[PDB]
């Protein structure tokens, strides 16, 4: 409509290409490139299990909010809420 409206599109978001959820070290749901393979399901679990064990003795007992692992062309962002692990797999900009 306006100069400040639909016409002005709003900042795009990079496409998603894989989604993943594990619970109790088991794949609840999985789509995109994260098909049913136990590569990322298994591999992240201990990446998560190790990355979660990095206390740093300054902010103690809570060694992260989110764990990105950036690649050249695609990114993984991982979340945990009570041993339910989320990975989003997308593009970088």
């Amino acid at each position: 409509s306006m100069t400040s409206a639909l016409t002005q599109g709003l900042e795009r978001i990079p496409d998603q290409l894989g989604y993943l959820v594990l619970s109790e070290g088991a794949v609840l749901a999985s789509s995109g490139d994260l098909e049913n393979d136990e590569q990322a399901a298994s591999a992240i679990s201990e990446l998560v299990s190790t990355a979660c064990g990095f206390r740093l003795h300054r902010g103690m007992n809570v060694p992260f909010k989110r764990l990105s692992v950036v690649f050249g062309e695609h990114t993984l962002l991982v979340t945990v809420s009570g041993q339910r692990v989320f990975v989003v797999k997308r593009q970088n900009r």
Binding site: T50, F54, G59, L67, S68, G72
Partner: protein, 90 residues
Amino acid sequence: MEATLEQHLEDTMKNPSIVGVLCTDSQGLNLGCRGTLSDEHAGVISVLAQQAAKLTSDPTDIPVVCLESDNGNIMIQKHDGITVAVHKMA
């Protein structure tokens, strides 16, 4: 400036944002660390740097293992054959 390794550790720490640095090569062995990082973290940083590389279907994709949180975000890149650990403020 004949480029010594402890130059950069004192050199990257110039930055107000940079809060500590640490170096490791794939052993868990501290090779020098400033600021927030110490010897406890040498083993932990290596392993997550090491396991995150298994997701590399094949190499030459260097996953900077970025790691957000409250105190700060922590990049981890295995790098020049030596795993580097920056700790920024974002």
